[PDB]
């Protein structure tokens, strides 16, 4: 993939959304914004050029599947790549999401190499 690809990271704890930035960083993805809500991330998905977001289940407000779907059904953005964040997985999460479009999830705490995982895995699952 494009190493400028342009990231969207959505996630109501600054702590997690540094994380996760500095974890695109050390793969080199450095093209990377921030949102705090779902409501925030369709507010600057709008502005265009956006290429990939990451996104917490679990947000105030727009939550990660409302997102997720609000997106799927538009449009320019409607195949945007959207990796879900989530604090414990449940199956009937997983398959709400993967239904609703998500391109793939992940279990948080997690590493740098997990994240290069995951992009990977989505990357060559649509072709990028």
Not at 24 to 39: H, I, T
């Amino acid at each position: 993939a494009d190493k400028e690809l342009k990231f969207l990271v959505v996630d109501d704890f600054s702590t997690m959304r540094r994380i996760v930035r500095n974890l695109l960083k050390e793969l080199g993805f450095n093209n990377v914004e921030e949102a705090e809500d779902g409501v925030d991330a369709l507010n600057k998905l709008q502005a265009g050029g956006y290429g990939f977001v990451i996104s917490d289940w679990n947000m105030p407000n727009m939550d990660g599947l409302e997102l997720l779907k609000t997106i799927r059904a538009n449009g320019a953005m409607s195949a945007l790549p959207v990796l879900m964040v989530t604090a414990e997985a449940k199956k009937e999460n997983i398959i709400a999401a993967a239904q609703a479009g998500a391109s793939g999830y992940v279990v948080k705490p997690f590493t740098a190499a997990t994240l290069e995982e995951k992009l990977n895995k989505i990357f060559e699952k649509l072709g990028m």
